[PDB]
Write a protein that holds these residues in place. Structure first.
Motif, short mmCIF file in Angstrom:
data_model
loop_
_atom_site.label_atom_id
_atom_site.label_comp_id
_atom_site.label_asym_id
_atom_site.label_seq_id
_atom_site.Cartn_x
_atom_site.Cartn_y
_atom_site.Cartn_z
N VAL A 291 1.38 70.55 32.06
CA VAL A 291 1.84 69.27 31.51
C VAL A 291 2.58 68.74 30.60
N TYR A 292 3.68 67.49 30.46
CA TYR A 292 3.71 67.11 29.47
C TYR A 292 3.83 65.98 29.76
N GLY A 293 3.71 64.59 28.77
CA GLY A 293 3.82 63.47 29.42
C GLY A 293 2.90 62.76 29.26
N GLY B 53 5.39 67.41 42.02
CA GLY B 53 5.66 67.43 43.69
C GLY B 53 5.02 69.05 43.83
N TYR B 54 4.15 69.85 43.57
CA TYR B 54 3.88 71.60 43.67
C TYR B 54 3.55 71.08 44.99
N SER C 263 19.83 81.41 34.92
CA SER C 263 18.98 80.67 35.15
C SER C 263 18.03 79.70 34.40
N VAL C 264 18.64 78.61 34.06
CA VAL C 264 17.93 77.89 32.88
C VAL C 264 17.34 76.79 33.71
N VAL C 265 16.00 76.63 33.57
CA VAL C 265 15.79 75.48 34.37
C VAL C 265 14.20 74.68 33.44
N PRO C 266 14.02 73.53 33.18
CA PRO C 266 13.64 73.13 32.55
C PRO C 266 12.02 72.87 32.85
N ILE C 267 11.41 72.93 32.16
CA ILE C 267 9.47 72.70 32.67
C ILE C 267 9.34 71.27 33.73
N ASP C 268 8.84 71.02 34.35
CA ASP C 268 8.40 69.83 34.92
C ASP C 268 6.46 69.77 35.26
N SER C 269 6.29 68.93 35.23
CA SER C 269 4.33 68.65 34.92
C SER C 269 4.15 70.16 36.01
#
Ligand SMILES: [Ca+2]
Ligand SMILES: [Ca+2]
Ligand SMILES: [Ca+2]
Ligand SMILES: [Ca+2]
Lengths: 26, 243, 239, 273, 243, 163, 239
Positions: free
Chosen positions: E127-129, F160-161, F149-155
């Protein structure tokens, strides 16, 4: 516009510098 | 340099050469050209940094006639006495220089905001002052100091000043010191050969800065041009010792 | 250095210079500028392939245009000026064999020598100065007076003694090589064919006596002492 | 273990290191990958014949003045007469032209000293003949019509003939080991401000004008043959002696007067026609 | 890495290999992969720290395509040029990395409040932020920097910046640099193998911070992947030297 | 900045029944007309006799007026949203592109003459790499960036995983 | 000389020739004519002044015109013929740097080498012969068949094996030097620029299989192994 941009045709060569043939520059 | 001794053929007697006075008052000799070029020259005196721009550009070039103020011409952000400093006078005699330059940058502030100084190698242009690279309207998301170029940071609350040494990152053997007309529009690749890159200063909030420049330790000048046509009106601004 | 008594052919004590298939004699003394160095070490890096010399073609003396000096010339006046090698390829002595290699190689490093021969008579007088300015593109109109000439490598000519002068010109440029020719297919971003300028200026006006000639002449001769070419290409006419 | 460290030192904080100096130490941070790497001068370096000091430059002969000498100039006549001050060519008028290398470089210092060298080149031929006397006069000067007062100083008489040039070393004889420049150390005037006495009273200094002069007088009237010019020009060259010295860096008294244009941004400032 | 020299079977004559230009201009060689990865990359440019949260999380992972900005996608707090820095470009060629990373954190302030930086070893998430751990509504009584984890403190009035080195505290031999899709929902233990833990920054009062990252001295990369499909439109944003 | 020779390898995807000859040339500063083979023949050339051997190596000499060459890409490009460009944008770019005139050409020497039983046209693969003395200097913003295939990371797992 | 088993790039056992800034590879074997002498001893007498060489320009391989061989060619047919140096100066590869010295020197002694590269396929067949005839002016039309070619220095090319051939040509002329250029001011009493002829002839017709190509090509390349120039003059355009 800016008078420094281009040298008058009668004193310069195609490279926008004094022609070596133009002795009066001094 | 050709002394002209070759043209002095007279061999008749002369008066004495005397004894030098160098070192009589003190040992602080100030005739070395490199020593002179290593003392700082003020370029910008209290100029503004605006966060709406990419940053304030400083072209990497030593002081010379290229920055001389002429009464009557348009006002620039350059200090007006650069052209009369001893080092500019020296540089006006040498058209080649190679090596690094040192910039002393002072941010007029005591805030904890970091101000970044980014080095741009020789790219072909020659600009100074605030500029919006590629004419965008926001740069905090695409900061020049975060693109990969070498960058250093100043934190005024710790020290509002810094001294950075920029390398000789260019394709040429020598940098060209000056042109007869700094505003002439001639062959574009040659036009950019008078600088070796830029230094870009970027703030967080609007603030002022001052900039000084000097030659680095790894620095040489050459291609002596002889003296140019000069002028002086000093006499008119002072009394003589006879009233 | 020392004259002799007169004989059938006058005072036969001339000196001379022989370079390749060209010879130039001098009646009096000659003044020569210092032999100075060119940048060395960049040649083997700027050119992956070997560079070439063609001494028999380039190292011979070639006369260029005649120079007229009149009593109306004022101090500082330009009598002649050359942007080199450019002017020796497309304006002066254009059919010279010295120009041959420039038709096929695109780059070069050049070291020259220029000899100046004057012929003023014994009742005339005057001084002329010839100097060189390295890498002068866009800086010809500053540091261009007799004062700057007296500071840079130069030779002085006295118009009544007719001493000869030899200017030795090393290769001092801000790049490794100078480009030899412009071409419709070549870039316009870089002005080629010029790594230096030679100026011939009046130091002290020519003067003559009653009913004397109001002018006299000077002739420049050049030769490369070291011309290295790089980057072979198809041959093209010069400029 | 986590032993305490009792070492300490008192410190005096300063913002910069070696800011005023031309030598010594610098705290500059290199904008390089390696903080200690430097520019290479292994292959590309300053040519050995380039001047290394301002004194080297002062040793370059420069044409200072010129004067005429004709068959009409009577004996004793001053053909040349000038205050020999490497600090200013004139004390009463602006100077514009090609200043000599030694004056140009002297204009960067507040003090100078040592002998000054002069060379007189007579632009003549073997048919011009005459004699002049060069004199260095100190403290007190001679009347234009009193040749004897000039003859009482440091003199060199030159017999013009087959040889057309003469060298003259001007002795340095003053009551101080060095002399202060007559130009200013700082002049903030940039727009040719019409000056008044208040401006002068508030200048950076007081001009200590020199009374030292060099004169050239006719000894034997020039007598050229009728077939050649009856008047010749004499070129006066000048440079610092081998023991010329300079000290006290200051604002340059001379500045470029020809083709001066300040840079603008290229190509942003309208270079795109 | 396989050079492909094995496939070059021609043995006929060739032109010279010449002489290298490395070191001709200067001795500042910049081709070492580790040297490149050791210079800082800006991650967060002036982002907010809010005391209502546990702190601002920074996942321990080097710059790469995992942080690349794509025109049109949702706005994140990551600076937009990370994906084009030389070090991200290098990391996009190596899927393994082992060792420590160094974070330079700058708190935009001059206050005497301590700001803590806490290290969390590999726990499985990424995670980040700003985040409220376990979704509580108050954290000053249960601060993450006071739970036992390794923590360091910044006191802006003394120095608003700090450089901390985080260890390689993970169960794996190597950390996985990147995935083809950073948002794909796949096997959860594998999902967390792209980080080696987190760094959490916690303030006393609301304040902003900036964060840079670089490889530590004890650091190695491996598992060379070869170059990916790339794009460039640089040509369109500048003049050529022929107008 | 970059410098040093560049290596090329031409792999002819053919068989022993294809035959012909081509000439590879490195041309500097000034270029040849598409219809003037002689202008190409006047430079640095390597003529390859295609036959049993189906590959040829070619080292491209480094011959320029500078010890190194500056990259034509930009050192910094802040444009991220494909901004429609105008001249003001270009006039305010990080530099001026010093376009190269150096070219490598391959011309037919002897017309390809394969037997009727095999393909009359073959593909030639052109490989490239730096020479052994290739050099690089002046770190800058990467001119190339991932386009696939460029997707920035999320938490993870907060964003919402948890389905 | 010996083939190897197939690998990624086929049978990688080519040989090559590197002369100056030019390289030429060969897939199979090559046939070479004998290295024979030129007249020596007249050079120092015919020219009082030193003669010159410019190897970097003249000793490199230069391709000339393409030669088409068709199934309609009969034995003895001339496929191509060259009067040298003339045809290599004003008709074939005219912009070649190899031609540069001929623009300024009026005389010369030349020793050459000509390489022939053919490309016929495995289902074709035929024989071609290339020979040289020394000092051929006004004697080209006699002793000009395949029989005379087989007797003089020659090389034979098989159109299906594609062996390369190298013809070594010494300088055998009835005078000390050959003249390089004709000129409006030069004499018309002596035809210049030709000290030899090269003939490319059909020995056995090219044949092909069902639906096979009715032709194939040969390419000649020349280089001077020894070009000595004498008598410098102003530069002129070639013929
Ligand atoms: Ca003495
Ligand atoms: Ca003594
Ligand atoms: Ca080899
Ligand atoms: Ca080799």
């Amino acid at each position: 516009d800016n008078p420094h941009r281009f040298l008058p045709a009668n004193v310069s060569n195609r490279w926008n510098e004094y022609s070596s043939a133009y002795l009066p520059r001094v | 340099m050709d002394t002209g001794a070759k043209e002095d053929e007279d061999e008749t007697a002369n008066f004495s050469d005397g004894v030098t006075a160098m070192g009589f008052q003190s040992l602080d000799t100030q005739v070395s050209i490199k020593d002179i070029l290593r003392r700082p020259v003020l370029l910008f005196n209290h100029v503004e940094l605006d966060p709406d721009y990419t940053g304030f550009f400083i072209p990497i070039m030593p002081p010379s006639r290229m920055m001389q103020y002429k009464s009557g011409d348009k006002e620039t952000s350059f200090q007006r006495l650069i052209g009369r400093t001893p080092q500019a006078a020296i540089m006006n005699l040498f058209r080649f220089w190679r090596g690094s330059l040192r910039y002393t940058i002072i941010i007029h502030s005591t805030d904890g905001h970091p101000i970044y100084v980014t080095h741009v190698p020789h790219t072909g242009n020659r600009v100074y002052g605030l500029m919006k690279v590629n004419n965008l309207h926001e740069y905090t998301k695409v900061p020049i100091f975060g693109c990969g170029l070498t960058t250093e940071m100043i934190i005024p609350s710790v020290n509002p000043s810094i001294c950075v040494e920029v390398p000789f990152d260019t394709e040429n053997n020598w940098a060209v010191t000056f042109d007869e007309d700094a505003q002439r529009n001639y062959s574009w690749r040659d036009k950019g050969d008078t600088v070796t890159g830029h230094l870009v200063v970027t703030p967080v909030v609007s603030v002022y800065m001052s900039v000084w420049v000097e030659a680095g330790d790894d620095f040489e000048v050459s291609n002596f041009y002889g003296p140019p046509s000069v002028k002086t009106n000093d006499w008119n601004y002072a009394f003589s010792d006879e009233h | 250095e020392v004259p002799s008594k007169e004989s059938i052919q006058g005072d036969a004590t001339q000196q001379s210079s022989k370079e390749e298939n060209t010879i130039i004699t001098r009646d009096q003394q000659q003044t020569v500028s210092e032999n100075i160095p060119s940048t060395v070490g960049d040649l083997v890096i700027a050119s992956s392939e070997p560079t070439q010399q063609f001494r028999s073609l380039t190292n011979r003396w070639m006369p260029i245009n005649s120079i007229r000096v009149t009593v109306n010339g004022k101090r500082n006046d330009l009598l002649a000026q050359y942007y080199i090698p450019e002017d020796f390829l497309s304006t002066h002595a254009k059919c010279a064999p010295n120009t041959i290699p420039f038709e096929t190689y695109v780059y070069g490093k050049y070291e020259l020598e220029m000899k100046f021969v004057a012929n003023g008579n014994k009742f005339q007088c005057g001084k002329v100065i010839i100097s060189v300015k390295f890498d002068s593109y866009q800086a010809d109109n500053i540091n261009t007076g007799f004062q700057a000439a007296l500071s840079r490598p130069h030779i002085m000519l006295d118009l009544s003694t007719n001493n000869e002068g030899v200017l030795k010109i090393p290769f001092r440029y801000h790049r490794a090589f100078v480009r030899n020719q412009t071409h419709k297919t070549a870039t316009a971003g870089v002005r080629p064919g010029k790594f230096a300028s030679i100026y011939v200026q009046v130091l002290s006006p020519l003067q003559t006596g009653e009913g004397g000639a109001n002018d006299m002449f000077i002739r420049p001769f050049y030769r490369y002492t070291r011309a290295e070419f790089a980057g072979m290409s198809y041959k093209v006419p010069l400029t | 273990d986590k032993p305490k460290d009792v070492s300490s030192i008192t410190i005096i904080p300063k913002p910069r290191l070696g800011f005023p100096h031309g030598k010594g130490k610098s705290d500059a941070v290199a904008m390089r990958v390696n903080p200690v790497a430097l520019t290479s001068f292994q292959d590309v370096s300053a040519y050995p014949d380039e001047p290394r000091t301002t004194l080297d430059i002062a040793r370059i002969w420069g044409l200072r003045s010129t004067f005429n000498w004709g068959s009409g100039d009577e004996h004793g006549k001053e053909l040349f007469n000038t205050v020999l001050d490497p600090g200013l060519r004139f004390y009463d008028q602006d100077y514009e032209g090609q200043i000599t290398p030694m004056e140009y470089v002297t204009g960067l210092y507040n003090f100078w000293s040592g002998p000054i060298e002069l060379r007189f080149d007579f632009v003549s031929n073997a048919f011009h003949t005459g004699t002049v006397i060069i004199s260095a006069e100190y403290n007190r000067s001679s009347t234009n019509t009193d040749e004897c007062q000039s003859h009482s100083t440091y003199t060199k008489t030159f017999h013009l003939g087959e040889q057309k040039s003469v060298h003259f070393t001007v002795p340095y004889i003053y009551d101080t080991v060095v002399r202060r420049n007559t130009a200013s150390a700082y002049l903030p005037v940039t727009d040719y401000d019409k000056v008044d006495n208040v401006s002068r009273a508030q200048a950076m200094g007081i001009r200590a004008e020199s009374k030292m002069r060099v004169k050239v007088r006719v000894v034997n009237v020039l007598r050229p043959v009728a077939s050649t010019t009856s008047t010749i020009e004499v070129l006066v060259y000048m440079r610092g002696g081998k023991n010329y010295a300079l000290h006290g860096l200051k604002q340059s008294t001379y500045w470029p007067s020809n083709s001066v244009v300040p840079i603008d941004s290229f190509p942003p400032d309208g270079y795109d026609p």
